[PDB]
Amino acid sequence: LPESPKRAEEIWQQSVIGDYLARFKNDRVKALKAMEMTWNNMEKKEKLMWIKKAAEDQKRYERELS
């Protein structure tokens, strides 16, 4: 029953989705496109906090399995 571990990009997406949806007046394909473009353009230094969160969620998954 434990949820699968979340990738760095997914954790970041969760943090910003409300804002992109409000921007694009709830055009969901466009909000998702915009987020895809943004993540793809982000430098490693900007992705690092999300990489860390993804590493911790792998540990969360492992705890929950045991």
From Swiss-Prot:
PTM comment, free text: Phosphorylated and activated by PIK3CA.
Localization terms from the record: Nucleus, Nucleolus
Membrane-spanning residues: none
Binding region for DNA: 2-66
Residues where Phosphoserine is found: S4, S15, S66
Disulfide bonds: none
Assembly with partners or alone: Homodimer. Part of Pol I pre-initiation complex (PIC), in which Pol I core assembles with RRN3 and promoter-bound UTBF and SL1/TIF-IB complex. Interacts with TOP2A in the context of Pol I complex. Interacts with TBP. Interacts with TAF1A. Interacts with RASL11A. Binds to IRS1 and PIK3CA. Interacts with DHX33. Interacts with PHF6. Interacts with CEBPA (isoform 1 and isoform 4). Interacts with DDX11. Interacts with NOP53. Interacts with ALKBH2.
Function according to Swiss-Prot or TrEMBL: Recognizes the ribosomal RNA gene promoter and activates transcription mediated by RNA polymerase I (Pol I) through cooperative interactions with the transcription factor SL1/TIF-IB complex. It binds specifically to the upstream control element and can activate Pol I promoter escape.
Connected disease: Neurodegeneration, childhood-onset, with brain atrophy: An autosomal dominant neurodegenerative disease with onset in childhood, characterized by progressive cortical atrophy, developmental delay, developmental regression, loss of motor skills and ambulation, absence of language, and intellectual disability.
Protein name in UniProt: Nucleolar transcription factor 1
Native organism: Homo sapiens (Human)
Lineage: Eukaryota, Metazoa, Chordata, Craniata, Vertebrata
Chain's gene name: UBTF
Shown segment, full-protein numbering: 481 to 546 of 764
